[PDB]
Every structure is written in C-alpha cells, then in structure tokens.
Amino acid sequence: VIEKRATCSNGKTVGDASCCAWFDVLDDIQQNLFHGGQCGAEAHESIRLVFHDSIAISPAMEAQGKFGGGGADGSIMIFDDIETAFHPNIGLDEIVKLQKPFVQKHGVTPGDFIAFAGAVALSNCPGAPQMNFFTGRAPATQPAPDGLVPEPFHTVDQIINRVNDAGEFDELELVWMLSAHSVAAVNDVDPTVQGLPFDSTPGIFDSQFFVETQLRGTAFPGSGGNQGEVESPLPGEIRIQSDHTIARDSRTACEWQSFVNNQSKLVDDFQFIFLALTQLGQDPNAMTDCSDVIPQSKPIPGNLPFSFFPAGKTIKDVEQACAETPFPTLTTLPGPETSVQRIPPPPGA
Numbered sequence: 298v299i300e301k302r303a304t305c306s307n308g309k310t311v312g313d314a315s316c317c318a319w320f321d322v323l324d325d326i327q328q329n330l331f332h333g334g335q336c337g338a339e340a341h342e343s344i345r346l347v348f349h350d351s352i353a354i355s356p357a358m359e360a361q362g363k364f365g366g367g368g369a370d371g372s373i374m375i376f377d378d379i380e381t382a383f384h385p386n387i388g389l390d391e392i393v394k395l396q397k398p399f400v401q402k403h404g405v406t407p408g409d410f411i412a413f414a415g416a417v418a419l420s421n422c423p424g425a426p427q428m429n430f431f432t433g434r435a436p437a438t439q440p441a442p443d444g445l446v447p448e449p450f451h452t453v454d455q456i457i458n459r460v461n462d463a464g465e466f467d468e469l470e471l472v473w474m475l476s477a478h479s480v481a482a483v484n485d486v487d488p489t490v491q492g493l494p495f496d497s498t499p500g501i502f503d504s505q506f507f508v509e510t511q512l513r514g515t516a517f518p519g520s521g522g523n524q525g526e527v528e529s530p531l532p533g534e535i536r537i538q539s540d541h542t543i544a545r546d547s548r549t550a551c552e553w554q555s556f557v558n559n560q561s562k563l564v565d566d567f568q569f570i571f572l573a574l575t576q577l578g579q580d581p582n583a584m585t586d587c588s589d590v591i592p593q594s595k596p597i598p599g600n601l602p603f604s605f606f607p608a609g610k611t612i613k614d615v616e617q618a619c620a621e622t623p624f625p626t627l628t629t630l631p632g633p634e635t636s637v638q639r640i641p642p643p644p645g646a
C-alpha cells in the first residue's frame with residue numbers, strides 16, 4: 298500500500314491523505330455518539346461491538362466447505378437483523394442503530410467505522426492504551442453464521458478453542474482481550490437490572506477487573522441464578538461464569554494475575570490484541586494506518602494506587618489460583634464496603 302503522508306485542513310499530519318476525512322467522523326461521534334467524549338454506555342457498547350463483529354470468522358468452518366464469516370467486515374451492522382438476533386449478540390442492536398447513521402452520512406465502510414468507534418471509545422477512558430486505527434475493510438457480503446461468539450456459560454476449553462480457531466490466539470491472548478471488561482457493564486444477564494459493571498471502575502481502563510474477579514464471590518448483586526452469572530464480591534458488581542473460571546483455570550490464572558499492579562503490561566497487551574481483533578479477516582499489509590487521527594489517551598487522574606483492594610476487602614478474600622507467584626499485597630481503600638453504581642444504558646439495550 299502506497300501511503301502519502303499529508304497535512305490535513307485542521308493542521309494535523311497523518312500517515313496517509315485518506316485519513317483526513319476521519320477527523321470529521323471523529324468530531325461527529327465524539328459530540329453525537331459519546332456525549333462529549335465520555336467513557337460511558339455508548340463507548341462501552343462500541344468496544345463490545347468490535348469483538349462481536351471481528352471474532353465471527355472460522356477457518357475450521359471454511360475447511361468444511363461452509364462460509365465461516367468475514368471477521369472484521371462490518372457484517373454485524375450490515376446484516377444487523379440477522380446477527381443481532383444471535384443470543385451471544387444480545388443487546389447489540391441498540392448500539393448498531395445508534396452507529397448506522399454515522400456510517401451512511403460519512404460514506405465510510407461499516408467495518409472501518411466499528412473499528413474506529415471502538416478505538417475512539419477507548420481513548421475516552423482514562424488509562425487506556427494509545428489506540429491504533431487502520432482502514433481498509435470492505436463491506437461484508439454475507440452475514441456471519443451463529444455459534445461463533447462466546448457465551449458467558451461456555452467452558453474455558455470451548456472459549457480457548459473458539460479464539461484459537463478465529464485468529465490463532467493462544468490462551469494468554471484470551472486473557473489479554475478480556476481486559477476490555479475493565480470498562481464495561483452488563484445489561485441483559487440479570488433481567489431485573491441493567492448496567493451492572495464488571496469492576497468497580499467502569500470508566501477507568503485499569504486492572505480492577507483482574508483484582509476483583511479473583512476475590513471470593515459472596516452474593517448476587519440483583520436476582521440470583523441467572524444463566525452465565527456467578528456470585529460477585531461487591532454489591533452492584535456482576536461476575537460472569539466465563540471470567541470467574543478463566544481467572545481460576547491453571548492455564549490462564551497466572552496471566553490473569555499478571556495484570557494486577559502492572560499497568561504497563563495491561564496497556565501494552567491490550568493495545569496489541571485490540572489491533573489484532575480489528576484486523577481479523579483482513580490482510581494487514583493491505584490496510585492503511587490512520588492511527589494519528591485517534592485522540593491521545595489520558596492518564597488516570599488523582600493519586601490513588603493503580604491497583605487496590607476495594608474497601609472492605611483484603612488479601613484474605615483473594616482466591617489464589619496462580620501457583621507460580623503469590624497475589625500481590627495491595628492497599629485496601631478505607632471505609633465501609635460501598636456498592637458499585639450502575640451505568641444505565643440507552644433504551645433498547
């Protein structure tokens with residue numbers, strides 16, 4: 298791909314002149330999709346959308362003579378009436394419908410738009426890696442088949458096999474991509490309440506997800522026994538069965554614990570695996586690097602430690618599963634155990 302370094306009308310230099318148009322997309326989605334550049338519900342939904350668009354690719358199926366999906370091809374938006382009805386994709390038609398208009402107005406491909414919005418969404422969350430953005434995804438011509446996006450009730454072996462088929466990702470990289478549950482909430486698992494976060498800092502890209510999933514689960518935050526849900530350690534926080542089990546499985550437990558108190562490994566690994574997800578089904582050497590359009594991510598504000606135990610929790614509440622290295626001794630925030638506030642989603646989530 299021949300790139301032509303250029304200075305856009307806003308005065309910024311980018312690696313290719315074709316990237317300049319994405320500055321108008323950026324300003325539009327920041328004000329009109331993310332309410333002023335927030336790391337709130339639409340940002341969270343947009344990050345989730347990247348994975349549900351991209352992981353739907355299967356070389357194993359292609360080897361059996363069946364279409365296995367095009368990976369990061371924007372199919373979930375183009376064929377939203379089909380894909381968003383798949384149970385793993387529950388609640389994603391809401392964000393697809395909020396995103397659709399931007400695609401049509403700016404004339405960008407659906408796949409490139411999903412990857413762009415995911416990167417911009419993450420750049421709005423303090424602590425996020427400096428995110429990449431490559432263009433070049435042609436519109437999907439066929440919807441993905443079902444059975445490709447992991448469910449919260451799937452076993453660890455099923456999920457490991459699924460991501461290995463999809464992109465040759467190993468079990469370590471499976472843990473890295475689950476860092477996105479550090480900026481995320483659950484709207485459709487518990488039918489009585491929407492917006493329960495996976496960690497106590499859903500607006501901060503940090504390792505609280507990895508700390509808090511390792512604590513002993515003691516209660517359900519809303520109703521009990523929903524499929525794919527297990528007890529969590531804090532009021533207001535939800536824990537799903539897949540994350541609970543991957544944190545405790547001997548193949549992935551030490552990599553899961555490796556992010557605790559290690560911000561630079563969290564940022565580097567997630568930067569890497571997020572980019573890889575957005576290139577599934579594509580030829581990296583045929584894409585254009587428009588990463589200079591993505592805003593600079595901001596640091597976490599304040600002076601609290603990077604990782605900590607939430608108030609009322611100590612090392613005694615950790616279910617140690619990594620046999621090679623002891624869970625780190627973190628500080629405990631002072632005061633009484635406090636509930637995690639929910640993140641109400643837009644209508645239809």
Ligand code: HEM
Nearest residue numbers: 341344345348388447448449474477481482483484485486
């Ligand atoms: C690998 C297996 C995974 C499983 C089983 C899984 C499961 C889930 C479930 C059950 C929810 C809540 C969905 C709902 O209530 O509608 C969710 C939300 C979310 N997931 Fe995952 N996830 C996985 C991997 C990923 C990955 C790789 C990413 C990102 C690259 C991701 C990003 C998110 C985000 C950001 C949310 C929050 C959505 C919101 O706030 O509306 N997840 N995940």
Ligand SMILES: [Ca+2]
Nearest residue numbers: 350368370372
């Ligand atoms: Ca797709």
Ligand SMILES: [Ca+2]
Nearest residue numbers: 479498501503
């Ligand atoms: Ca967090």
